[PDB]
C-alpha cells in the first residue's frame, strides 16, 4: 500500500479559534482515522467527533480534521491512521502537537 | 519489520553546543541512513557529513547522529531510513526537529 504523511508538526492557537490537521494517501484501504494522546506515556487513542465541534473529512488523497471552539482540554499530540488494503497491517502519521493559549 | 522510533521529537540549543539524536530500530536489512529537510515545503533529501563534526554511529538496535558546535544552517529536520529485511519495503522514523538559538 501507500504511505502517510501528516502537517503540520505542531500548531498554537488562541482558545477559541479553530484548527486544522491534514494526512495525504490514495484511499489504498484508505477510510482514515483519527487518534488522540494527552500523556507520553500512555499509547494514542481514538478520539471521540464532539457533536458541533469536530469533523472528520476526507476525499481520496486529502484526509483533514478540523476542530473549532479550540478548548485548552484539547492539548496533545493527534495521529491521523490508515489501515492498509493489502499488507492489512495500520500506517500512522508523525501526528502534530498542539498547544491552546492566550487571550 | 520493526517500526523505527525516533527520538526526541524536537530540540532547541544556543549554537556551538554539540547534538545527538537517536533513532530505534531492529537492524535486519537495517544499516541506517539519515535524511534532511531544511523546510516543510522541501522534501527530504539526503544528508552529507562534514568535517569531524557530523558522525552518524549504531549497532544492534540504536542508530545515533550526532552533530558538533551547532549552526542556524543546522536547523530543520532529520529523518532516519532502514531497508526492511523480508518486504523490501522502507521504513522512516518520524524524524527529530532541529532549531538553534541566539545568545
Redesign the interface.
Known amino acids: 500500500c501507500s504511505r502517510i504523511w501528516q ?4 500548531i498554537a492557537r488562541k482558545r477559541g479559534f479553530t484548527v486544522k490537521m491534514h494526512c495525504y494517501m490514495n484511499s489504498a484501504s484508505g477510510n482514515v482515522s483519527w487518534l488522540w494522546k494527552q500523556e507520553m506515556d500512555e499509547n494514542p487513542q481514538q478520539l471521540k467527533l464532539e457533536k458541533g465541534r469536530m469533523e472528520e473529512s476526507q476525499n481520496e488523497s486529502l484526509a483533514t480534521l478540523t476542530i473549532q471552539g479550540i478548548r485548552f482540554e484539547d492539548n496533545g499530540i493527534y495521529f491521523c491512521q490508515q489501515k492498509c488494503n493489502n499488507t492489512s497491517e495500520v500506517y500512522q502519521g ?2 502534530t ?1 498542539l498547544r491552546v493559549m492566550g487571550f
Open positions: 502537517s503540520p508538526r505542531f508523525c501526528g502537537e
